[PDB]
Nucleic acid binder design. Structure first.
Ligand SMILES: [Mg+2]
Ligand SMILES: [Mg+2]
Ligand SMILES: [Mg+2]
Ligand SMILES: [Mg+2]
Ligand SMILES: [Mg+2]
Ligand SMILES: [Mg+2]
Ligand SMILES: [Mg+2]
Ligand SMILES: [Mg+2]
Ligand SMILES: [Mg+2]
Lengths: 96, 153, 159, 174
RNA sequence: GAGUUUGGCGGCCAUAGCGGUAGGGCAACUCCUGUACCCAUCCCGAACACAGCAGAUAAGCCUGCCCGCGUUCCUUACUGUACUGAAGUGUGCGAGCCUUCGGGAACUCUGGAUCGCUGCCAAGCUCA
RNA sequence: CCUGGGGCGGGACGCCCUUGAAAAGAUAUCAAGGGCGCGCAAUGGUUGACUCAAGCGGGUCGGAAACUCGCUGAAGAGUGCAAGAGCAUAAGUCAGCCUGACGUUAUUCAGCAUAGCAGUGGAUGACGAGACGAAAGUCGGCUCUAGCGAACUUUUGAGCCUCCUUGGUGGGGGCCAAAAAUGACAGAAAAGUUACCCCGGGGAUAAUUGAGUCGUUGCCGGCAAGAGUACAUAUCGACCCGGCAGCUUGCUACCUCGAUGUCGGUUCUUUCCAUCCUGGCCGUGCAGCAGCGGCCAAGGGUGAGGUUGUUCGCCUAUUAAA
RNA sequence: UGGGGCCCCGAAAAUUGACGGGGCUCAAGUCGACCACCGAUACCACGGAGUACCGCAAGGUAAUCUCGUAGGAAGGCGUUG
RNA sequence: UCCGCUGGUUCCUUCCGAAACAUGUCGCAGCAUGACCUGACUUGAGAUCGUCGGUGGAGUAGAGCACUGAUUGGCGAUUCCGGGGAUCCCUCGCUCGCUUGUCAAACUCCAAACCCCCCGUCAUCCUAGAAAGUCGGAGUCCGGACUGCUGGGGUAAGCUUGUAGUCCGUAAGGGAGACAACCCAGCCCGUGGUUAAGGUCCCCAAGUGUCGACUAAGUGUUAAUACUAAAGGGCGU
């Protein structure tokens, strides 16, 4: 039977480009966001902790608040709203 | 400006194309609408090319269509007096020239229905299974929408 | 089994050696024929395919044998250089219960092709061109697809 | 070692071999300034650096060469020169507007009695807030004049010069 | 007050790498001289640490250059080719394929470019 | 219980990874590759110092089998165990110091897209105590995703509440957590036979009449390798390739279970040709007789008996042929 | 010699028989174009019914209202007391 | 008595109008919860079925060998790990490099067209009430077919199991000889008019129509289609 764990079908989803593997840039981890500021979900495989479920890959949410070193996002899946915790290392601003 | 005339019905049609059609005011075959020439309308017309014809319309055909098949709010025929007293242009021909030049629009006639309900094409058209380049009637016509529109006076 | 059982291309490829098991070997022994060390043949004709299909290795072996015999009989042992191109990488499986767990098991090997894709190639002199055409026409008779002959190099010489 | 398209080349500051990015990532998580105490043979350098998406802006940058105005006519590579540099840097940064941060020694061995910890002593004694512990602070016995006693007994004019430079550092920045 | 040089902390992370070659050290960095002290070796003052005057640009670092490998970019052809969204009373015995409107490669080809760009601060200076 | 009818076989009956799956998410089959129902006081935490696999050059029998020195080496190693992903001043190797393999508690995510569903897990946090480290920080086991179970019942740990008019003793009842198992893994204390069988339904589902297909079966074609004393084609015909019929057996489940009466023989009528004889032609390795091979032709003929239920098949004496 | 269009051989099945049938040969077949006409409840016009929404009523708007099984809802007809 | 199993269940019109799917189940001819339909009420301003531009996600088609597995010969050497017949007399396969010829569903240095989230714009809906919320009543969990995906399996099948769109189910009327789902069309009643699909020798309404060629076989006179014969040959034209 097929499994239904939390990392299924992520062979290429959670990979790094060949000229990207290793230590990722550190400035991406100290970026700071404010309220109501659209961001993009782009999971960085190099960081093991604070990773949202990879089904939210490539979605855009808005910041709602901060809990420690993690921002609270508001992502739409289908017709629902899902609140996703993610460290700022996996996030990326929207360029207007 | 464009001249979109619908020529195929609404059975066995995608829901995306149907919803674009209803956003263009076209609900029934032999119905016409006049829309400006901007990229939004250009794309919207490009998406329903296999159910409507279209092209550039001149002053004579537009004036004729307004004088023949123009209805007001409540199915009341449009006449010379309505144009000469509501707007400022003398007759239908001058107003048509102003509209085609872009110096006026059909919103300057109060209580005018946006949709024009024409007659089925006298003498018959080419056929609704081919585009114009294949010897049919669907798709872009360029300046030859006047021939089909005049045929459907 | 009959030839038409495994000739159409309807399903995905199935070629990874390390996942399947027990693929039987092949019969075609040598893929180069004739004078390999020569490189000065001015005419280079070839047999091409007109439709996608699958060719069993046995058909390729029969075609190679017949072309070899004809060419050696007429042109000579040192007057040509034949070279087969397509190698059989596909695998063929035959079910053998009914439809209960109908997935098959390996029975052979096949080589897929594509339209207008060269299969054989013969290089000869000017005096043995007709013999080359005669040889390549019999080889295409054992092949499971319509085939035409194209003179690739030295077309002005022959024509 | 670029031999093909799959080869992975390190960052520029890694090819130079003058940075450690894991340490840098651990340091930036403090949300607070950093004190850089990079040293050399002819002198020592201290400066306060904060991060930004473009680069690393710096607010204060004091160097041990600046003692020449005050009158520290001794060696610039000793521990006491580091203490003087740290002291004047601390006073300068306190008056400027900045007060605290984190100690960052980069790729250098953290051993008690070093010149880096001498600069740390000079910083802490000035009022510049900084988290640390006292056990690594070098004792003043080597601070004054006594880490060159055994080979330069003919030169023990240090302590009076140290006192004069300390009082002049206080005088200028107060 | 503008510019140059040197030094430190960095952003993009091979257009920056690999290899080759000719020049420079006055201020600065480095090499470089030893082991009283804090410090050190699974043995070694090699390294790290401390103390630093000598000599040197042979190395690190800096400037100029090289198409020789690798990477990035443009152009000629391949080619509007392969593939493909929508509609079709278009076509094949069949597995399939064709016409119109709209998108559009990869490798390879002729010829050129790429031997990093850039942010903050300090010091010596060089002007009015 | 699942099930290309049921049975037999197996478990696709719980959990984890890759493909199928058509570049967001979802997606079936007794689909393909598989694994798990554990092991470790160090194989765990933190700080410090380093770089691994494999080659090339040198050294004493240290043999193409040992250890050491120098060079190339972004990883070709290792990381407990499947598959996939991650990791180089390190998530790897070794040393020092330690036990965070801590007590309590709130949300959000997936299991269970969208869109309800336990228990139970994983990510952020909060309170109280610590380890390592100059500090920043890291630590809620072993880099990430598997290694597990409700209610009721018993046992164990800390402190309290309680037993019927009141107070005490012995003994019960309760709250919170941990352990004991339901593998058919969202949780019955559970073996067979019926041809002596009975009932309610089903073409929602099988024998075989029909329809579809043709692997197989019967009958042909293409190229001709070769044999035939020479000569591919008088005669036989390889390998490979392409078909026709529905006359054998398979495959499927479209019709029929409030019934379409099975095998063989007998009687009687008819149709097809892919010709056994009768009629006409062509070739021959056809002297004659008689043969061998092919073409047109369905008008007429095609029988009698022994074994066997037999179809089929063997045998006997005739016959133009049976 | 190569590349194309159509046709011929290859081509055998069981009641009598299926281009829908008759028939059709510079076509009543095939290929490339073209013209005129026929042909729906579609589209246009007129009259009528109902419905949805608004309005105190009169009445107003409807190209953007009129198919329908399981099923939900509203208003009416009939039998006995 | 009981059954999840079979049969029956009586008047008219009007408004709206599905699901044959997911999870749990001693569950598979049943049921519960959700999706989908309907009625009422609360609140009070936006919503996105569509177009264009931009910030992002791609790892499929195609293509290719740069990793992982395969794969064809020539050349030069591995003075090895190797098989042929006392200086291992010397032959020399496996292997390592330069060139040639093929591959991949569990390969990727590359890399589309569809598609998905968000911002702006146009466009449509909306105070005659958007989005959201609360309560009442259900049916449904035997589906089938056509056009795409070379979909997976299978020799194939009017076979079996998926997916996007649209249909039949529940869809009249017109045309296909008849045709559940193919083409035109989605339909209140009556009259007039013009057209769509398709047709115009007769059956049968309207052409024994026009222009330029082909076929001599009654071949053909058959959009799609479960209803239509192949390889090979022809000094037929
Ligand atoms: Mg059963
Ligand atoms: Mg008995
Ligand atoms: Mg019964
Ligand atoms: Mg009803
Ligand atoms: Mg491909
Ligand atoms: Mg039910
Ligand atoms: Mg359809
Ligand atoms: Mg319908
Ligand atoms: Mg009908």
């Amino acid at each position: 039977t097929n499994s239904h764990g939390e990392k299924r079908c992520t062979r290429y989803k959670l990979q790094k480009t060949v000229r990207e593997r290793g230590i990722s840039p550190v400035s991406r981890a100290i970026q700071e966001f404010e309220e109501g500021q659209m961001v993009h979900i782009d999971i960085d495989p190099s960081v093991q902790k604070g990773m949202p479920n990879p089904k939210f890959q490539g979605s855009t949410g808005k910041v709602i608040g901060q809990r420690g070193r993690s921002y609270v996002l508001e992502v739409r899946s289908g017709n629902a709203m899902k609140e996703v915790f993610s460290l700022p290392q996996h996030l990326k601003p929207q360029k207007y | 400006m464009y001249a979109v005339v619908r020529l195929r019905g609404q059975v066995n049609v995608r829901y995306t194309i149907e919803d674009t059609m209803k956003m263009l005011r076209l609900h029934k075959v032999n119905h016409c609408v006049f829309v400006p020439e901007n990229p939004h309308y250009k794309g919207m017309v490009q998406k329903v090319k296999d159910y409507v014809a279209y092209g550039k319309i001149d002053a004579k055909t537009l004036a004729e269509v307004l004088e023949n098949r123009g209805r007001l709010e409540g199915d009341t025929r449009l006449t010379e007096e309505y144009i000469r007293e509501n707007t400022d242009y003398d007759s239908i021909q001058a107003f048509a020239e102003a509209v085609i030049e872009g110096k006026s629009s059909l919103k300057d006639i109060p209580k005018l229905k946006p949709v024009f309900r024409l007659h089925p094409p006298r003498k018959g058209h080419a056929g609704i299974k081919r585009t114009v380049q294949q010897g049919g009637v669907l798709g872009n016509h360029d300046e030859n929408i006047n021939v089909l529109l005049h045929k459907m006076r | 089994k009959p030839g038409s059982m495994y000739r159409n291309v309807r399903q995905r490829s199935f070629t990874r050696r390390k996942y399947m098991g027990g693929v039987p070997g092949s019969q075609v022994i040598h893929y180069d024929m004739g004078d390999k060390a020569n490189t000065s043949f001015p005419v280079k004709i070839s047999l091409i395919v007109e439709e996608k299909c699958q060719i069993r290795h046995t058909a390729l072996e029969a075609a190679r044998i017949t072309a070899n015999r004809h060419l050696v009989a007429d042109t000579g042992k040192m007057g040509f250089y034949m070279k087969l191109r397509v190698y059989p990488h596909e695998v063929i499986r035959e079910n053998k219960s009914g439809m209960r767990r109908a997935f098959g098991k390996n029975v052979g090997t096949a080589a897929r092709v594509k339209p207008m894709q060269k299969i054989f190639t013969v290089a000869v002199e000017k005096q043995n061109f007709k013999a080359a055409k005669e040889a390549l026409w019999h080889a295409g008779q054992k092949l499971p697809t319509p085939c035409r002959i194209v003179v690739d190099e030295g077309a002005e010489l022959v024509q | 070692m670029a031999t093909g398209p799959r080869y992975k080349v390190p960052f520029r500051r890694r090819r130079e071999g003058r940075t450690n990015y894991h340490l840098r990532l651990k340091l930036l998580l403090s949300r607070q300034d950093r004190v850089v105490v990079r040293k050399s043979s002819r002198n020592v350098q201290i400066q306060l650096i904060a991060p930004t998406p473009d680069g690393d802006i710096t607010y204060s940058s004091a160097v041990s060469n600046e003692l020449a105005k005050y009158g520290y006519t001794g060696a610039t590579g000793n521990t006491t020169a580091a203490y003087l540099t740290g002291l004047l840097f601390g006073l300068k940064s306190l008056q400027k507007g900045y007060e605290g941060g984190i100690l960052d020694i980069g790729l250098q061995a953290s051993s008690a009695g070093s010149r880096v910890y001498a600069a740390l002593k000079g910083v802490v004694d000035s009022g510049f807030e900084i988290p640390c512990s006292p056990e690594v602070f070098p004792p003043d016995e080597r601070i004054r004049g006594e880490h060159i006693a055994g080979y330069r007994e003919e030169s023990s004019d240090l302590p009076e010069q140290f006192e004069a430079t300390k009082e002049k550092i206080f005088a200028e920045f107060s």
